[PDB]
Symmetry: C3
Subunit: 278 residues, 3 copies
């Protein structure tokens, strides 16, 4: 009457293997949910021959700018303060309404930044704020990726608001030269898009005002816009769980368990033979 | 007498397949050891409606602070130097012993930072150090994540040492306004923990001292504490090698090799038939 | 005459499964090409007992340096400006030709940085530039990983050019103390190499010149070189697609499809039996 016992015994292999099968599909499902929740990042650096001329959206307001001078040389030659002119920018002043507020027009000024990173070209601006009641001399600016696109785009009055919302506006101080070493990051969201963001590393250098040494003491600002490295750090969140390399593995495990059940039927046959031997 | 030769020939399939099997399990084992050694990082940005009020653990020492003023406006209105008062902080001065030393009590001061990032709220502090022998005016500070937790926690005298050991204490200078744009990173170690770290980007703005223009020339410090972006960069090291999606693949490869050995037995049968045909 | 119809019907399982097989190998091939294009990054922090003494390649030019003083104390004690001496560096002045130009010899100066991060040792330099026509007082520097290697290496005149090309040269300003908190990143390119890069976070602190308060007003520079954290952020791009864990999965899927074709032959047998029943 204990033959059905041996039957359920040989079937215990089926039972345990179906149990580990449902356990494994559960674990694989929950791990796929996890790896689908938050993907994995991946950085790659693509060295570029020469950058596309960025757009420096300075917001001087009242402070008139003195000079512009690109300098392929690693060092900007000796300047002469308080003297306007010497401008050699492809500058363009453009107005728009702050998308944050729409309550105050923020006059701007656009500059074609440096292009030749290997030649180490660098825009060197100069500004002046003849004494006012600001109490903190600061001219904030902004960087978008390619200046020619701004020149050619239609209704750039709105393209500028799009930039101001996309990028971030960090100010350069007043009273010392701020060597801004720009650098790009072409980050790619997974929804088939490419987002260009500027990450810069300022380095302020104090201005020795002993050269003018006068009674005017008018505030004057200095900037240097440079390309940090000839590379473009582009980061894209890689989806580490595709719907294919997981179902194939689940099928492989299901087949492993099926083959194991077949080997278990073979082992039950061997055990029946051994019992017949006894 | 050369039949055993054909036998060992048909068995050479078994031999080579068992060899590639041990090679593949070796490679999979060593790759699992590697991917278990150092996991893969993964960044995700979770935009928050409004931040939990951080805790600014300034260490003024002797320098009394003049004013506090939150400013939902993007710009702090014009200040008046040398004049105390106007404080509207939920400030709290707290003492403790430096866990690094335990040899000197470091008087502190806690401030409830800004909360509404979308409203662009910003704490604007002011300090004074009437002329002393410091030779370098610097007031270091510290940031922990949520101020109300500090208020409610028990024995915050030790919670502060825990913070000082966990976070990092970077000083803001003296003589110009330092626009500190705080930002959080809720990093998650894999051992079921969540670590909150502050990564800020200062931006100093020189102070035009021509407004006081007196013979006192007392050192005075300005700060601005702001939330950089409404996002919270949270990074978690994803374990790229789970103990399951590797053993399933090993079993799939073992079955591929078993099926290949079966097809090889079939090919040996075909070769025996071809030999019988000849 | 419609028996061949049932034949092609049972064969439609073979057809659809071979179709999904070629589709799956196509998808796996293209995903392997993708994951081979750009690998996945992975950060790990290895706390070190004590750092290997870095090499600070300052480029003073004409500015003679006043003093050196390591300070295990977290704060450098009160200095005395304008007074040379007090040097306790293992300094070494070395010349070479700028690999960028080869048109101008750039005199340098090497300093053995701090070693004991847990002891919070910190090099504190001092410089002077008696009034000149620079108009912007800046002394740029440079960091390589281990100073003893520089001392022992052969023909360091070229090792220095190698460093200048490998690392990046960021200047510390003139007129205020720049607390440079160095930190290493031992990044590993996949081609069996280990690249050591310095990523530092400066923090300038204004110099109160009321202590000299003379008519000389000579430019003088202050630096502090410190180790930020006792950790060494080492990042290595993990190849997320190995040539092995993909072919094993492809074989597992091929076997899943073979077993499915066998079950389909069984289903065709069941359908033939059902048709015979009718
Ligand atoms: C862009 O906006 C600026 C600032 O509003 C304009 O500058 C003003 O132009 C008017 C023209 O009559 C002057 O009267 C004002 O004195 C200017 N500045 C202010 C407000 O004091 C500028 O005209 C606008 N764009 C351009 C270049 O036309
Ligand atoms: C926290 O520590 C500070 C600094 O030690 C304390 O400030 C001192 O308080 C005593 C009270 O009699 C004064 O006599 C000292 O002049 C204060 N500062 C020093 C050392 O000169 C403060 O009292 C402590 N906490 C509070 C708010 O009670
Ligand atoms: C490394 O280069 C510097 C700068 O060229 C050398 O300093 C010059 O040394 C000569 C020796 O006669 C002096 O006449 C010059 O006045 C020095 N500086 C300059 C150019 O004005 C230095 O000698 C070189 N290395 C060493 C330490 O010998
Ligand atoms: C600006 O630079 C170009 C470079 O070729 C030069 O030709 C031009 O004369 C410069 N303009 C001025 C205003 O000097
Ligand atoms: C622009 O400002 C107006 C108020 O003048 C406001 O009603 C509108 O919503 C703003 N535009 C947006 C969508 O930000
Ligand atoms: C200072 O700037 C203003 C314009 O903002 C101008 O009217 C005034 O003449 C300037 N002074 C000098 C010295 O150029
Ligand atoms: C602080 O700000 C709140 C905002 O409602 C205001 O009601 C309160 O009067 C302010 N306190 C002072 C000291 O002005
Ligand atoms: C605190 O300082 C004391 C010396 O007063 C020292 O013995 C103790 O180890 C310190 N606590 C720790 C664990 O840092
Ligand atoms: C300067 O600060 C000290 C307190 O540190 C105070 O005794 C002194 O009166 C202050 N001077 C002024 C001008 O308020
Ligand atoms: C430099 O520091 C060491 C530390 O032991 C000291 O022995 C030596 O006297 C110092 N040198 C000078 C110039 O003081
Ligand atoms: C070094 O400069 C010379 C010019 O004097 C130049 O010909 C050579 O290419 C430079 N070396 C390199 C490879 O940078
Ligand atoms: C200033 O430095 C120069 C050397 O560069 C030296 O000749 C001159 O005597 C120095 N002056 C003082 C006050 O030491």
């Amino acid at each position: 009457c204990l033959k059905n016992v041996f039957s359920v015994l040989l079937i215990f292999i089926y039972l345990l293997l179906m149990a580990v099968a449902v356990f494994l599909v559960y674990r694989t499902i929950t791990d796929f949910r996890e790896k689908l929740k938050h993907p994995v990042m991946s950085v790659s650096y693509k060295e570029v021959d020469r950058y596309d001329a960025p757009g420096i959206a300075l917001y001087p307001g009242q402070a008139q700018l003195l000079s512009c001078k690109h300098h392929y040389e690693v060092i900007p030659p000796l300047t002469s303060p308080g003297q306007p002119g010497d401008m050699n920018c492809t500058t363009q002043r453009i107005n728009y309404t702050d998308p944050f507020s729409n309550q105050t027009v923020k006059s701007a000024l656009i500059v074609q930044g440096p292009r030749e990173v290997k030649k180490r070209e660098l825009v060197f601006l100069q500004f002046r704020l003849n004494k006012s009641s600001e109490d903190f001399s600061a001219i904030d600016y902004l960087l978008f990726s390619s200046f020619q696109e701004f020149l050619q785009s239609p209704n750039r009055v709105g393209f500028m608001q799009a930039c101001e919302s996309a990028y971030s506006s960090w100010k350069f101080s007043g009273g010392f030269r701020t060597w801004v070493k720009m650098s790009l990051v072409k980050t790619k969201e997974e929804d088939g898009r490419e987002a260009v963001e500027f990450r810069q590393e300022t380095s302020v250098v104090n201005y020795i005002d002993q050269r003018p040494a006068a009674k005017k003491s008018a505030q004057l600002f200095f900037v240097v816009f440079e390309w940090k490295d000839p590379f473009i750090q582009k980061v894209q969140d890689i989806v580490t769980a595709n719907p294919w390399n997981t179902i194939a593995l689940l099928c492989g495990a299901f087949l492993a368990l099926f083959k194991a059940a077949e080997f278990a039927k073979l082992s039950i046959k061997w055990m029946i033979k051994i019992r017949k031997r006894y």
